[PDB]
Amino acid sequence: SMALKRIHKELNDLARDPPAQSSAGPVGDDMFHWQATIMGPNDSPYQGGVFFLTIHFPTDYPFKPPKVAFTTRIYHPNINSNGSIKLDILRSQWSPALTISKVLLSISSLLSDPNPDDPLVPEIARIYKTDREKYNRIAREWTQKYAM
Amino acid sequence: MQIFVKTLTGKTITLEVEPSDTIENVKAKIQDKEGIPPDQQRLIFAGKQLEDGRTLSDYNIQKESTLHLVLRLRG
Amino acid sequence: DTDEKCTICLSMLEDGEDVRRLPCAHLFHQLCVDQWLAMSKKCPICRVDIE
């Protein structure tokens, strides 16, 4: 399995050089299902929050993107209440040269810099675009409530 | 002349305008206030979409009228 | 004569395997990028359409 070779390689690279901002690995015996955390970025309203993600590598990874979803509730225009993430590299802009590490980095950038013009959750996108402070407040409150 | 622009999110913006201000101008004020490009703004008054080249007065928008802003978002 | 990785499988590019160079000049293992290009026209690295 290319997927498994690659998932293992990525895992080994993570163990060799762990990131600061994230952690990830397989759930028990399941190499295709990972849990991950990402830190709410500093200077975002998610700061201080630890956000848990569930990652499912498809069996034709890396030719198809990993499914990545938040399990921690988060208030964000590109992440809905099921934790689906609307992030181009997880859908149409996937490349097999991307790695879970890069995905987590893009997710972290997505937290820092939402894409409210391509939202998953229009209500939040709208608030983000017209009342950033409210968005910041709510996202902070949700961070405090769910991710801390 | 004060007019209000109520966003879909319920936030109301007070704009200082003149009856001769174009919808384009109002959009520019919203851009100025909110950072929202005019091309993302749909402005509606009293069930009518406001067209860029028309003026506030062409729509009988008077002081204390509330226009509605709806942003154009992709999905 | 490099330890450069095939960005798809993350193994050495210069292992036994056939490599394929795309028109953007990015190189991958043939097997690796073939499987990608069967479903995408885009170089995995630079996203330039190969066609």
Ligand SMILES: [Zn+2]
């Ligand atoms: Zn390869």
Ligand SMILES: [Zn+2]
């Ligand atoms: Zn290329």
